[PDB]
Amino acid sequence: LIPDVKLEKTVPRLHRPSLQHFREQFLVPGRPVILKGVADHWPCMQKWSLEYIQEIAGCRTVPVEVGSRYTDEEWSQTLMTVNEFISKYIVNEPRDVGYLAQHQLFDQIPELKQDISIPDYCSLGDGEEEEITINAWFGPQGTISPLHQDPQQNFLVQVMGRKYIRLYSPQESGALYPHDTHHNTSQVDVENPDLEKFPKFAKAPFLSCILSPGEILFIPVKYWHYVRALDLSFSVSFWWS
C-alpha cells in the first residue's frame, strides 16, 4: 500500500539548487530537502535493471539481512551470491523478506562506480572525497529500515523503484523513545505505533515523502529516518561530513 504523503508535511523539492543556497538553507540548519535534476541522468538510472545487475554482479558474494533491525538480537546476515539473493528473495515466492542493505558494493565492483557520481554538494563538507561511504541498498518490495539516526550527512539516491520515507528532526528524540542514546534506533513502529506504550509519538511533527528514481534525498546528520520500499528497489547512499 502507498501512504498518503499529501496529508503529511512533504519534504520540499528543489531542482539543482545552488551550492550556496543548499549550504545556508539546508546543510547548516540541518533541514531535509529533495534534489531534482541532479542524478536523473546518471547512467545507473537507465542501465541498472534487474537483468543488468544480475549479469554483472550475480557471482559476487554479498551480505543479506533478514529480521527486524529494532534490536541486535532480532536480525542477522547471511553471505551469499547475488544470484542466490535474487532467486530466494525477489523472483521466487518470497516467504521471508531479505534485504541487501548497507553494503559497499562499489568498492567490491569498481566498474559500477562509473554509473554514479559524487554529488557536487558534498564539497561543502569538511571531510575528504575518499572517506565518503557509498552503500548499496537493493531489495524487494516491503523491506523496512526502522526509524534510526546516523552520524554523518547523507545523500540517498533512488535508482530503482520507490520508497516511503519519514523524517523526524533530532529535536524530537524524546517523543521517539530511543533504545540506547549512544547509530541510535527508535523503539517505535512508525506505521503501527503502540500508542499506549509510546504516547508522545502521536503528536511528534515530521516530514515525509515518496522518493522516486532520479531523486536525491538529503538526510541531515542525526536526522531520524524510516524507510519502506514500495517496489523492487535499488538505492545508493553517500555518507559524508
Ligand SMILES: O=C(O)CCC(=O)C(=O)O
Ligand atoms: O534505504 C533504506 O532502507 C535505509 C537507508 C539508510 O538508513 C541510510 O541511507 O542511511
Ligand SMILES: [Mn+2]
Ligand atoms: Mn540510515
